[PDB]
Symmetry: C2
Subunit: 131 residues, 2 copies
C-alpha cells in the first residue's frame, strides 16, 4: 500500500525543502539531489501512488505533459545532445522512493550515465528560464 | 531535423514490415521488441509520427502513457516480474536507435541485471502471455 509518510509526500506538504523548477495544480518538477548529470530533474504527481502500476490513469496525463515540458526545457537550458526519461517500478527496477516519479536526465555525446543545494539552485534557474 | 518517414516504426505502422503486436487502439501499437533486454520486453508507439518526446503533440502523449501503464501491468503479470522499468530515449546521445517515439516496457527480476534477434515464433509465445494478461 501507498505510504503517505514517504519523502516525496513530505516534499509535497512542504515538510522538507526542494529546489523546484515547475509547479501546477497536478505536479511538481524539482532537482534530483543525487543527479546523474547536471540538470537531472524529477517530475511527480501531487496525487500519491507508489509508482506507475497503482496510479489513477487520469493522474498520468498531467504528469506526462509536464515530463515533456521539462524535457524540452532541460535540453534547452544545458544545450544537451539528448534527454533520457526513466520511470522505475519496484525494487527490482531500482525504485527506492515509493511515490511515482519520472526522471529527466540530460545527455551529452560520448558521456555514459550527492549535490549541494546551491549548485542545484544554479541549475534550476537555467531550467526555469528555458520554460 | 526532419522526421524520417522511412524509419522502421513508421514502416510498421503503415503495414510495410511485420510485427508481433500485443495491443492496439486508434492511437497506439504495442509490440514485442525483437532484441529484448529481458523476455517480454515490449515497445509502445504512437501511430501519429514524431521523432521522439520533444516534438510529439501533447495530446498524443495521453493515449501513449495510458497504454504504457496498461502494458506495464500486463507484462508484470504475464511474466510474474519483480519489477518494471520504463524508458524513453531522445536523440543519439540518449541511445535512441529508431527515430520514432517509443517507450520501452521491461520486466525485471530481482538480482538479474544487444543485436541478437529473438526468433519470431518465440516473440509470439511471449505476446500470447501478455495478450492474456491484459
Amino acid at each position: 500500500a501507498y505510504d503517505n509518510n514517504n519523502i516525496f509526500a513530505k516534499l509535497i506538504r512542504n515538510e522538507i525543502p526542494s529546489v523546484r523548477v515547475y509547479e501546477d495544480d497536478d505536479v511538481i518538477a524539482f532537482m534530483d539531489i543525487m543527479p546523474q548529470a547536471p540538470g537531472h530533474t524529477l517530475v511527480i504527481p501531487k496525487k500519491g501512488s507508489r509508482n506507475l502500476l497503482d496510479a489513477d490513469t487520469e493522474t498520468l496525463f498531467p504528469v506526462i505533459k509536464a515530463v515533456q515540458k521539462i524535457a524540452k526545457a532541460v535540453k534547452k537550458a544545458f544545450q544537451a545532445d539528448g534527454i533520457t526519461v526513466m520511470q522505475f517500478n519496484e525494487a527490482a527496477s531500482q525504485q527506492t522512493v515509493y511515490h511515482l516519479h519520472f526522471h529527466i536526465i540530460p545527455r551529452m555525446e560520448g558521456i555514459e550515465l550527492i549535490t549541494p543545494t546551491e549548485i542545484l539552485e544554479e541549475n534550476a534557474k537555467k531550467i526555469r528560464a528555458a520554460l
